[PDB]
């Protein structure tokens, strides 16, 4: 019921300003003992707290990054906004918003709930949407009663891409692999689903690829090989 949902640009150019928004529901920031923070995590590295705003509008900031940051809230919109100036490639990270809660008669629960986070990449390279190709199941490539088919999502930038199958109706046997970062600086990934070998003839399979950074979605039908 409590939700924290981060949003903002997937890609920022060096020296530019980043603005992120946390849209929350299920609780009120004006409630005594509530606060919301932004915390970031560079890929494969540690969490780093950036700023916090509390129910009384008091703000706190990272002592090392303070000069670059502003945090504010909009009661009317149930949003908390972070601004960070002079972005650099080292600022590429997943940015999370997290809630803190004090329950009367108990110690504070710091960062008790976290959003899913939003990835921000700082780069001079331009956005590029993916080319999506079907990976059709072959007759020599079945595993007895099951077969794997998939889609290749080639040459996109920046991350992330998400993939579902049959508009979410097909969930069993789905495996979307982490992307490869090519030497070219573009990414590719693949998603596969395992289905009954006998179904290939009668069922329609469609991968739904979402590349939010390029505002692109592709639904690619994966036809039996012929």
């Amino acid at each position: 019921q409590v939700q924290l949902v981060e949003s903002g640009p997937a890609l920022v150019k060096p020296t530019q300003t980043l603005t992120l928004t946390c849209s929350f529901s299920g609780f009120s920031l004006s409630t005594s003992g509530m606060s919301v923070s932004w915390i970031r995590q560079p890929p494969g590295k540690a969490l780093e707290w950036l700023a916090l705003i509390d129910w009384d509008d008091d703000t706190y900031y990272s002592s090392s990054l303070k000069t670059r940051l502003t945090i504010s809230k909009d009661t009317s919109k149930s949003q908390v906004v972070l601004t960070m100036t002079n972005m650099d490639p080292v600022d590429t990270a997943t940015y999370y918003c997290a809630r803190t809660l004090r329950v009367s008669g108990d110690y504070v629960r710091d960062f008790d709930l976290w959003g899913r986070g939003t990835l921000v990449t700082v780069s001079s390279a331009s956005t590029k949407g993916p080319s999506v190709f079907p990976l059709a199941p072959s007759s020599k490539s079945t595993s007895g009663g099951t077969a794997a088919l998939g889609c290749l999502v080639k040459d996109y930038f920046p991350e992330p891409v998400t993939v579902s199958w049959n508009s979410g109706a097909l969930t069993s046997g789905v495996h979307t692999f982490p992307a490869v970062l090519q030497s070219s600086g573009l990414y590719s990934l693949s998603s596969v689903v395992t289905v009954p070998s006998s179904s290939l003839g009668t069922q329609t399979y469609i991968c739904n690829v979402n590349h939010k950074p390029s505002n692109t979605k592709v639904d690619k039908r994966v036809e039996p090989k012929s």
Partner: protein, 215 residues
């Protein structure tokens, strides 16, 4: 950029009690409560311990936190496989107008887990890609443990390294690992060989899959 000091890694065998330390200073851990967070690959951190060694609903009491002077510790008793994750401590620092400090994180390994051979699925270039004047072979590798493989590609029977790109292994939900490898070719190269193969080596054994253009 202040950070509480944690060891980069910790390990134990199932059933064991494993501890993870977190070292700070008088103005953070020395003066304030330490919390702990668990982060499984691919997800946001979740609060594990807060306040007076308190646990949010859903966190078993075999996770417990302690603190003394300027260091804190997370003890995980009755170690289980699902406990594999990165663990972070955090504490407020009263100095410099106030700020949060997080630890550098500790990756917890449960050792002695059963080996598992990789499943390999190999796809040839699609007709659609070939008609766009490109060719990519896609080798998907799943369900292996431990999480280290090497991938080699062959054109016919001979090694090919040019055009190969391979991911680091990544932990799946089941604590096994997955990886993928891609071989970029021209459509002329694809068509001019009898076959191409992806060979995955794991714990001294190999699985090789082959595709051919004529198929």
């Amino acid at each position: 950029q202040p950070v509480l000091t944690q060891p980069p890694s910790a390990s134990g065998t199932p059933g064991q009690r494993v501890t993870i330390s977190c070292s700070g200073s008088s103005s953070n851990i020395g003066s304030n409560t330490v919390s702990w967070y668990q982060q499984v690959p691919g997800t946001a951190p979740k609060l594990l311990i807060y306040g007076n060694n308190e646990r949010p609903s859903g966190v078993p009491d075999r996770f417990s936190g302690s603190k003394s002077a300027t260091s804190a510790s997370l003890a995980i008793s009755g170690l289980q496989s699902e406990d594999e994750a990165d663990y972070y401590c955090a504490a407020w620092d009263d100095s410099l107008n106030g700020f949060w400090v997080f630890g550098g994180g500790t990756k917890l390994t449960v050792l002695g887990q059963p080996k598992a051979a990789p499943s390999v699925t190999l796809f040839p270039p699609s007709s659609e890609e070939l008609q766009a004047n490109k060719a990519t072979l896609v080798c998907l590798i799943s369900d292996f443990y431990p999480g280290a493989v090497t991938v080699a590609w062959k054109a016919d029977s001979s090694p090919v390294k040019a055009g190969v790109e391979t991911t680091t292994p990544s932990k799946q939900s089941n604590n096994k690992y997955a990886a993928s490898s891609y071989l970029s070719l021209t459509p002329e190269q694809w068509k001019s060989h009898k076959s191409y193969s992806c060979q995955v080596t794991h714990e001294g054994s190999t699985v090789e899959k082959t595709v051919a253009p004529t198929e």
